[PDB]
Each structure stands twice: as structure tokens, then as C-alpha cells.
């Protein structure tokens, strides 16, 4: 009955380039941290819980961390239990790199 | 298609501050951080 | 020939009989891409391969 | 400063009145005037994107 069903639902195109610059700028982690903190009452308790969980992660499986940044590991673990694929430890790759190092602007 | 206002005037200094405050209260400090990056790039281009 | 008191030799940053502490360079005032934000300058490669701004610094280590 | 100037120039609009037309648009003329509406029809107007 209300004639706005599709005028407010038409898919915005040209979004593919405004999907990537989020991913190397750390935007996905920044937008995931707040969604994890959307239900917490005291942020300091949440931070302390994250730090303790990361300390446990470092203790149980020591000989893996140094690259994986176990804090990123626990954040990805918490974000991966409600959908939100979030690749392991938010690890970044170089799909097109026949070289050792990017210039990084 | 978002919930925004189509500006049709001059966005001066005091209008930019008002717009950022309203985008913060309506979306949060996680969505606004990406807006500010985009507006910085578009502002520098023009 | 030279009279008394006339110049015989130049010196550091003293081309001619005049002081010269810099160089004349083409300049355009415009905001390029934000790389000249606040008080930033955006020079070209022509200033590094023509030795436009190139100086010798001598350090003295005493033991 | 710089981003603000960019955004201001972007959202500055057209030239409203006498700064966009030298002569008044009342100016009863250029109607392609005759007894019928079958004349030259340019009507540049503005684009209709």
C-alpha cells in the first residue's frame, strides 16, 4: 500500500571500489570492534577480558604467535561465531606480488 | 539507500561541523570515520 | 688589472660581489592534492638531479 | 581549510539572477511566434538526466 517499497531498496551500484579501501585501511576491524562493544556496559572490562583471553591464547599454543597477533586472533574468533566470516587473525595477503615489499605510498 | 538530506546550499565551515555531529549521532563513530576519509579525498580533489 | 679594495676571489654563497643564500625557482601557488597541507612544499625531481639544492657538510671527529 | 574549500566550491551552485543573463527573460520575443506552434523548436533549456 505504501508506495516506497523499491524506491528505498534499489541497489546502489559502483560499490565494488567502495568495498576494498575499507579492507586495507583497517576499516573492517574498526567497524567490528564497535559492534562487539555495542552490548558491553563497561569498555574497560571488555578490554581486560580480551587481554586475558589473548594471554591464554599465547600460553596454550606459544610457538605460533609473533605474526598472528593473538589479539587479532581472539577478536576474529569472537566475530566468527555469529556469521561475519572475518578471516583468521585478520591476516593480510599479497595476491599480486612477485616482489618482497610494497612501497606503501 | 540510506537516510540523508540532499543539500542544495553552500556547506561552509559551521555547516560541516553540524553535518558531522548529525552523522555521528545517527550512524555512530564507526561509520563516520569512513565518511570523513571519503570527504577528505573528495574535498582535496575539487 | 685591479685597483685597491676591488674583488679578487669569490667565496661560499657569494657569487659575484653579492650575497647569495638561495636559488631562483619557478613557483605556482595552488593546492595540489593535500600534499601542500598547512606549510608543506611539493618540489620536483629537477631539483635533485641538476644539483639545484646540494651542499657539502664536513664533520670533525676528534679522538 | 583545503578540504573545506573543496567542499564549498563543490556545493556552490550556479549563477542565480542577473549574473547568468545579460538581458531580462521577460523580453517578449524569441517565442518562435506565429499563429501555430509549428516552428523551429530548439529549446536548449537544461539537461534532463
In the numeric block, the cell 523580453 is attached to: D27
Cα→Cα distances A6→A12, B6, D45, D46, D49, Å: 12, 19, 31, 28, 20
Contact between C34 and D3 using a beta-carbon 8 Å cutoff: yes
Asked if A68 and A89 count as a contact pair (C-beta separation under 8 A), the reply is: yes
CA distance D23 to chain B (A): 26
Contact state of B1 with A9 under an 8 Å Cβ cutoff: yes
Nearest CA in chain C to D6: C31
Do D11 and B11 lie within an 8 Å CB cutoff?
A: yes
Distance CA A1, CA D42 (A): 42
**Is B9 near chain A, with CB under 8 Å?**
no
- Which residues in C lie closer than 8 A to residue D3 (C-beta atoms)? 34
| Residues on chain B touching A35 (C-beta within 8 angstroms) | 30
Query: Distance from D12 to chain C by nearest Cα, in Å?
Result: 19
Q: DSSP assignment of A67-80, as one string?
A: TS-HHHHHHHHHHT
Which residue in B10, B9, B37, B8 sits closest to B23, CA to CA? Answer: B37
Cβ pair A29, A75 in contact under 8 A: yes
Q: Is the separation of the CB atoms in D11 and B9 below 8 Å? A: yes
Residue D32 and residue D40 in contact, taking contact as beta carbons nearer than 8 Å: yes
- Cβ separation A27–B1 shorter than 8 A: no
Instruction: Compute the distance between CA of residue C21 and CA of residue A63 in angstroms, rounded to an integer.
Output: 59
Largest CA distance in chain D: 58
Question: Is residue D6 within 8 Å of B46, Cβ to Cβ?
Answer: yes
Solved by what technique? cryo-EM
Distance CA D4, CA B12 (A): 7
Residue positions counted in chain B: 46
Residues of D in contact with B40 (CB under 8 A): 3
Residues 6+ apart with CB under 8 A from D30: none
| D9/B40 Cβ within 8 A | no
Beta-carbon contacts below 8 Å between C and D: 5
Amino acid at each position: 500500500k505504501d508506495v516506497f517499497m523499491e524506491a528505498k531498496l534499489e541497489r546502489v551500484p559502483f560499490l565494488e571500489e567502495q568495498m576494498r579501501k575499507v579492507n586495507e585501511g583497517g576499516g573492517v576491524m574498526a567497524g567490528d570492534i564497535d559492534r562487539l562493544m555495542k552490548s558491553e556496559d563497561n569498555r574497560f572490562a571488555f578490554v581486560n577480558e580480551i587481554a586475558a583471553e589473548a594471554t591464554a591464547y599465547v600460553n596454550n599454543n606459544r610457538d605460533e604467535y609473533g605474526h598472528k597477533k593473538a589479539i587479532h586472533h581472539v577478536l576474529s574468533n569472537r566475530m566468527n561465531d555469529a556469521g561475519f566470516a572475518r578471516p583468521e587473525a585478520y591476516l593480510e595477503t599479497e595476491p599480486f606480488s612477485p616482489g618482497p615489499t610494497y612501497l606503501k605510498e | 539507500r540510506a537516510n540523508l538530506v540532499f543539500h542544495n546550499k553552500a556547506i561552509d565551515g559551521t555547516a560541516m561541523k553540524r553535518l558531522i555531529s548529525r552523522l555521528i549521532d545517527h550512524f555512530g563513530m564507526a561509520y563516520t570515520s569512513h565518511i570523513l576519509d571519503q570527504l577528505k579525498t573528495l574535498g582535496f580533489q575539487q | 688589472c685591479v685597483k685597491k679594495g676591488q674583488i679578487l676571489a669569490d667565496g661560499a654563497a657569494t657569487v659575484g660581489g653579492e650575497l647569495a643564500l638561495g636559488k631562483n625557482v619557478l613557483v605556482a601557488y595552488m593546492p595540489w592534492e593535500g600534499y601542500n597541507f598547512e606549510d608543506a612544499v611539493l618540489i620536483s625531481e629537477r631539483l635533485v638531479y641538476e644539483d639545484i639544492y646540494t651542499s657539502f657538510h664536513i664533520r670533525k671527529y676528534e679522538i | 581549510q583545503d578540504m573545506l574549500i573543496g567542499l564549498y566550491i563543490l556545493t556552490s551552485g550556479n549563477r542565480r539572477g542577473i549574473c547568468a543573463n545579460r538581458y531580462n527573460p521577460w523580453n517578449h520575443k524569441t517565442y518562435q511566434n506565429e499563429r501555430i506552434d509549428d516552428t523551429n523548436y530548439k529549446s536548449m533549456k537544461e539537461p534532463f538526466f
